[PDB]
Amino acid sequence: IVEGSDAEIGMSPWQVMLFRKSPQELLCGASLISDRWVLTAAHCLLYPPWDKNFTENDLLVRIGKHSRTRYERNIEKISMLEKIYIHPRYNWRENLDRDIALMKLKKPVAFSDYIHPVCLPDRETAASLLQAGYKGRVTGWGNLKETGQPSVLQVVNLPIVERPVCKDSTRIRITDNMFCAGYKPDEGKRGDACEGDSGGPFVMKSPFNNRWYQMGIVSWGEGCDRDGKYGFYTHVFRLKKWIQKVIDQFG
Amino acid sequence: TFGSGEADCGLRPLFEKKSLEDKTERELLESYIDGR
């Protein structure tokens, strides 16, 4: 996270760390959506152009964490994956269309003050929140700068950007399964996701029922916090029927 | 039957369930108020 700040304790209890065992490194962010389902970006698990093709046994999931590196006794819970489900139409050859994946935990995780699932948006919630200028929140342990790793989980609030501006900002083909967020050069403020934040949640707090909803997944960006560029996020609501189909069939 | 998730989803034990705000959630809520 670039130009963010330390998250507060318990601020993002759905935040999941995807951890590679060998070599020992943070792979990606992810989010807790039930006691045994974790949501992340498909490109965290499968991206042949960068020789990424992870299996269930390659990764450790760490939930409830705050420190990037310190073992947090009686706070964090580690978990293993029973099965990875990548969207069958995830487009890794081109533009990361449908950049979404689900991970089933082998055991259900106990909820606590530090571990709690985020909501997925219903139709009215999505319609009322996914508006240009409305701010969501991105969290992760990714790099602090484009060229630099944080000691603790970082957070930044970013406004959703008008789709024609998103499209003008990039040579990549943008689909309806993506949106973009970030400040414009004229707005002054800054902030972005960066390498290592991929797969973590873009969340918004409903002013109607006080609940936090995951509207996006950190998907891709041209650099980090560059003027005139914007982070792109997987449009979670548009793919929610696939999420439900997977959990309802394979849970 | 999954729907939008847990009946309890999105309510953080250390904030919403304690009637406590985090340090920047006001910024989000204020952005959801339309201008003129």
């Binding site: 139409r89 081109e94 139709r123 008008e162 040579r171 990549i172 083909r173 960006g221 | -």
Partner: peptide
């Protein structure tokens, strides 16, 4: 105040991302 993403469901070329300098 304008929609930033469409309210519908995904029902079912160009430059690949990995060619863009600085892509992440």
């Amino acid at each position: 105040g304008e929609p930033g993403a469409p309210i519908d469901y995904d029902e079912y070329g160009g430059t690949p991302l990995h060619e863009i300098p600085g892509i992440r």
